[PDB]
Design brief:
The structure is cut from a larger assembly and holds two copies of chain A. By secondary structure, chain A is α/β, with parallel strands linked by helices. The first copy, chain A, contains eleven helices and ten strands. In chain A, the strands form two sheets. A seven-stranded mixed sheet of chain A has the order 3-2-1-4-7-9-10, with helices on both faces. In chain A, helix 3 packs antiparallel against helix 4. The interface between A and B is small, with 7 and 7 residues. Chain A: GO terms for molecular function: ATP binding; GTP binding; guanyl-nucleotide exchange factor activity; translation initiation factor activity. Chain A: Pfam families: IF-2B.
Chain lengths: ~325, ~325
Amino acid sequence: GSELSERIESFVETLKRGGGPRSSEEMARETLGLLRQIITDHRWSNAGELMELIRREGRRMTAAQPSETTVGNMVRRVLKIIREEYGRLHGYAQLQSNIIEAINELLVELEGTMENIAAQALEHIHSNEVIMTIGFSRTVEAFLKEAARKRKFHVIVAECAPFCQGHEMAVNLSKAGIETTVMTDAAIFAVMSRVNKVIIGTKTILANGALRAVTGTHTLALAAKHHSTPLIVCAPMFKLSPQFPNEEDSFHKFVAPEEVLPFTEGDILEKVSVHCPVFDYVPPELITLFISNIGGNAPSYIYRLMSELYHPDDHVL
Amino acid sequence: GSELSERIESFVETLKRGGGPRSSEEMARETLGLLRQIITDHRWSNAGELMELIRREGRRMTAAQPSETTVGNMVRRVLKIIREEYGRLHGHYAQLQSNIIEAINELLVELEGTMENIAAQALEHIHSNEVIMTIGFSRTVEAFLKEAARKRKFHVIVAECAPFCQGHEMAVNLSKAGIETTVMTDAAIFAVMSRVNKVIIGTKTILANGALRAVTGTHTLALAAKHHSTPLIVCAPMFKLSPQFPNEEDSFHKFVAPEEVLPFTEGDILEKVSVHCPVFDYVPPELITLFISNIGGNAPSYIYRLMSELYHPDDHVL
């Protein structure tokens, strides 16, 4: 009814203004709850009518923020769930409760994601090891702070210059006692000679195995490729997107250049061009291993997860 | 005269038959002593006559063991000493001879303190809790590591050489100094290269490219260290630097009897098999990071300059 459009408009302008909520798994839970509220607050006879409905609100919700893909791919996963249930019921009226319980299955699958990645983390960390991360990500800090229960090693958390978010990861890892080392972002190739492996997170995994992530991680991947150290992308499968990299150049999220060059700089701000991209593109050849809630996978396998999680008719959404 | 002739042929048959003396600096000292005995026990009026005498005996001395290039380039440096002093005295019979003798004695007193000068600069390349990888056995790298271990604590992964495991010697010589060394086979090099911080090896002969022949299995070690982008230290003195280009002549690798690879008690499969045992291997200069000699650290993009500072281009074919 009307409250449905209230919640939809609140979510849309919440994504338009800022980050609400802060981390992305909460955003996937809100998106799936909003989608189950959408499918329980409408009337339809065919599944295709609900498909156009969900496509319309997905177009609106991804036009709210093109840089954040979790809502769009969650809408796309709900679309594939609807298509699979319509295909298994076609070969009618019991469709709605089946989609509700399938989305509930997806929510129970999704709530135990970071702890499933944490459970398989001990198979990748040995004692007295040098780890380098970038940015701040709750997946990687849960990974490391539970792998530190039985191992003793070293983590070099490199801050990112636009928003020094690696400082929060540093003060969160030092509470667990992992010998946290804080450095700048300019010393990454200066310390790549001693880092044994690089364990980072991401914002969005693309269809070809590539990933957008916090900016400066393409440099980190190049330095780790030069030193041949393996890259561990601790990423869940709601950061899996079928969007190819070269698509209307709407890849990077540019923010106000205040965090790079402040407004009190002078008259030189008029004759200067300051860019602040908070995301960066990493090709799949610079990635060694993905760690998802189903296990470890190669970058030569993400298209298969793509075909297992999304339908090719909904790539345009 | 006759004593000098029998000394020359005892040395040449010692190099033809086996390894006499044991390590390479001893052989460089024997070569310099033999050459100073040559220039003190002959008669010459012009320097070119003595040049052709040194060339005629050095040709046989390098035809004894072509893999042992220390005698050859040591003779070649003596020839450049002859040419330098004849040029400085031409622009001359007894003063020239005594100047050659004192310059060769200068060469001996710089050559004797080579390993201690390499050890003195070892501390600027080794930090504490570092993983070092070594192939073969060499007195230069052993003095390097046991000098750097007087103030630093690190680790050494010494790898044995598969034909005859000479690196086991280095292990029992390193563990006497308390290095926390690690012995493995050379089948695990790329298995362990992901944790080795620096690779420090020796060599047998530095070529004019910056390339080097060394104990076999070190080209694989250089490839594994290039894959992992770890730097290479070649603890080599300045008498293992030869002007012979790699692909110029034949007889590069020294092949030995295949007994050390496949024993004679194998059976009748020895008659239908081809067993090779190359005890040397060729490492191109692009897989090498840094040379450490008695004059300091140098790039592989600099060895040709040391060639032109130590040898003359007319004596390359000798």
